[PDB]
Symmetry: D2
Amino acid sequence: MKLFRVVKRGYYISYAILDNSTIIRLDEDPIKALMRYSENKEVLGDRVTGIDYQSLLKSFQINDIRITKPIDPPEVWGSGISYEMARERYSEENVAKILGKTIYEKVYDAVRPEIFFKATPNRCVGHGEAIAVRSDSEWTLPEPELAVVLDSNGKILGYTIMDDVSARDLEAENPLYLPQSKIYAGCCAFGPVIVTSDEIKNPYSLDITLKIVREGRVFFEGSVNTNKMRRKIEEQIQYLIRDNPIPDGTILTTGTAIVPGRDKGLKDEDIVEITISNIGTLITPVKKRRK
Amino acid sequence: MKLFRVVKRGYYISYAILDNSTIIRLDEDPIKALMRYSENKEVLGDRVTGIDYQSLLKSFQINDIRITKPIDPPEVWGSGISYEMARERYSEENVAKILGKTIYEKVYDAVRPEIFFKATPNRCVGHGEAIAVRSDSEWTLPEPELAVVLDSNGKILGYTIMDDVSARDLEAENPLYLPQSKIYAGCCAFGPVIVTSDEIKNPYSLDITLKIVREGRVFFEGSVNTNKMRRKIEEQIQYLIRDNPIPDGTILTTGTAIVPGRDKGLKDEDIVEITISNIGTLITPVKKRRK
Amino acid sequence: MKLFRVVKRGYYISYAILDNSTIIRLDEDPIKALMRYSENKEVLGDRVTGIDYQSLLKSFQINDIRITKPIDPPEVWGSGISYEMARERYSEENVAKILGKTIYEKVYDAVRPEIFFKATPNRCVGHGEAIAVRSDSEWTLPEPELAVVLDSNGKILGYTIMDDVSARDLEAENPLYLPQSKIYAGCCAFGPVIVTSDEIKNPYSLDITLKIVREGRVFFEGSVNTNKMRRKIEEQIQYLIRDNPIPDGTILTTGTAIVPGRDKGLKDEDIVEITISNIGTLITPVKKRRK
Amino acid sequence: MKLFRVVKRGYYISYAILDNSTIIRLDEDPIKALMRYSENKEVLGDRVTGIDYQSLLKSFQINDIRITKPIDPPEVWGSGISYEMARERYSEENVAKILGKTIYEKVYDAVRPEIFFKATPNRCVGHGEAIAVRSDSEWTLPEPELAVVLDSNGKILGYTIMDDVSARDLEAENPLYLPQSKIYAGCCAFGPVIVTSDEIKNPYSLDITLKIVREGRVFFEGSVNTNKMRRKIEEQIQYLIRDNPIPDGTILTTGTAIVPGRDKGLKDEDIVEITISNIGTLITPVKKRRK
Ligand SMILES: [Ca+2]
Ligand SMILES: [Ca+2]
Ligand SMILES: [Ca+2]
Ligand SMILES: [Ca+2]
């Protein structure tokens, strides 16, 4: 089951597409619906015709309906430095270093992984909506990541593509500015669908691809496979929920491995495209904030 | 106007006490009520007898009613290193240092202050309720702070006492563990009231006092005045709201200056008392989390 | 307990006055509150000062608050011809008569009493609000009645004064026009309070008094005691609920004995005052409907 | 557009069927949807497959879904003696008569028609649900009628089949018992659909057919056309709304012309079938009330 939501005349409608192309309109709340499918694979609703899912991915935006965030995640959390060579996060001399070793390569080795609060639902956007660059950021990058939808017990309800938009220049300036660099209006994008757990046989065998498009020009292209992930997801979830209750429908984003250069910073009207196998391609335009 | 809330048989009731001891039961939502008083100093409700405010502060807990969080703040944010000598936050050789200067004494000097996400409402507790020490923390300290209640425009609606409970050992281990050290169940306490802006003539002239009580024993006592605050509140608010929309009733906590030693770590059944002039005294028992 | 409601800036507030003059602001819904007092005589709320109940009865209407319908009764039902000499309801030759005996004097004798649907809540008005005379009625009279508040099981939750406003000329024209004569906008008034069952020792010993006031002039005055009621209330309730479920807070009005003459018909700007012992006096101005 | 509702696992879903057999699942409230179609003939929703409307009419009741009342009418009103020869309503000597002429043949002639309150929504049932015979009624008949759905201005939003279930023996006993004979649990049935105004070209040219089925046996069969209606619907609506506000979705039932005999009274387990051209056939089992 691949799950998506549209906004129509002020109200939401949620639809699920099956492997045989049949589209089902949902009766329940999408988060409630994912929790159901997790237990017994049951879906409540009616089969619908005249809903062009493929056109929605391309155009947005057809007649009356517009695709958006598939769910409203009550909390979005992030997990840092889970990949090979992710330690070199700003290799300039010098960043923050404890006993000669940098803070980022410390966490890569340490038992306890990095976990940070990323966004509230109203700070998130969906497929076809604009992500943002802070007014006071000269170097902001998109971070293409595999993200999991969780229940209150930390059980994986599904997978999605997430863009952890990071004002990298503020982070490099001082690690204590990380929250300012990560948490703002339009700092987070996910979609276009949330695939159910059974739609992906192996989460550690998926192709993530980033493309930044500036006036038709491919400004950056890079891709990495999930087999390069060292810190496993189950461990990230374990440290997330420890003494820390999360609501149903929490999204955890698993960290990035595709890092564009110092010159590849985002600017107004850019088009960020992220592709993950079996899920789809998330396309979000970029909007530079005015001071 | 000094504003407080009680829970009674599953439902909330909000009361306001005036300077002449008269107590008013509120008609509106407390956050909505603070926004009103901010504009024209109007209070909607009836004067009530038989509500013993002084007994509520001491006992909790009288007949049918129990004092709790005065409001439900949709978001709680924190501001770090705003005081003199707050730079020495773990002076051990070495913590995180950029170009020989430590990250904490960098922020003290830098134009951009430290701002971090602290808690969601359900992670907060009130007067007489238990704060928590993480199951995996050997050194957790309370941080006595002056806190402001804000509207969506960043206007100060009122003041309160806040305990920013911090698992200091995890922070010292690596600054990237800060979110884990700060954000958890029972990580935050505030109250017992929210005083309106006009109840404090000068916010930079208030006595903050910390007391940790272990089996009747005064385990720690320290106090500092707000005149020692270098980073002004208006500046902290400015950087909080920048490209970052906050809901009505957001609490910002302004940073601490009272820091107990390495030996003064919290443990089960402790009693943390925090006093700020004109506001009152916040008393919260301590509960150690089981693994 | 004597229960009343006020409207204040678009919202309702319910208050209860006790025998020792102490006034309590209610926590619960008034219908829910009456059901509670019926079981264990418990009242949830706070004692309030500055609520001038006596002034509310006279003026309406003080500062911010206006008295209105004490509850919103989901259904209002009526019971006809329960009094001595009520058989002579329009003695003119002739009204509707079966086998030489008139339909009204038939019901007075018959095992089965008269029960009719009277109003929906939005068709009812309260103390100080305007009752109405239909645009096509030349002879409309008020019917001063003792009314009971019922739960779904038909248990008496309390007593109130009710005005069953009846377009008597339409009824006399044809008994099948009774629903048109009884059910319309402003066809029903009750209040000013609902007294709890224990406030009246004997419901069959109460003085009901009607007064129609035209420009300061006492246009009609009449009064009768409830000891003149032949058809008992418990029997009226029995036939009401039979195969007919009623919601909680249903009002049953027990029939009238004070009937003004053919010349004493109501007209615009009249003042109808109804008094019942231990309850109070219900005052409603009259408003003639335009065609 | 022909509109119907189903109940599924505790919640309602509304569907519309078009003339070309295409079935649309509705986005809006059915009453809100009828008001829309009345203004511009616009329908909000998605075309659905796998909803077997024809099977729903026969079986009820398929898998997960059960047909019921197409809407929840806030008020149901009735209009009496609108047909030829309807004057002979119980011709026995004697019923209620004014000046030698019977009350029923008076209303047939009089300018003012008969209008009565019939039911609240919770007293109504739908296609496939049980209608009721009062525990104290020895002669109860179904009254097959054309019914209109109205808005607050008295505009016709659509048509449906309605059964005005009447305890005829109580009415014959005394006309003042009419409310008891008409208003009770399961006193009213309508459906199976509500057809939009444009689905019927001429409301005064429709075949209404009654069938009472006792253990497979056709116990009664009778039918009459709407061209035999003397009192027009527009006039019935006019007298309904006069000084009497009705909510959106009010149903008015236009009176019957098919009257079974004194021996044809209803009893337990009977099957009452009513057919009106272009609308469908309403089938409701009968359930005798226990004392
Ligand atoms: Ca990231
Ligand atoms: Ca702090
Ligand atoms: Ca009456
Ligand atoms: Ca009828």
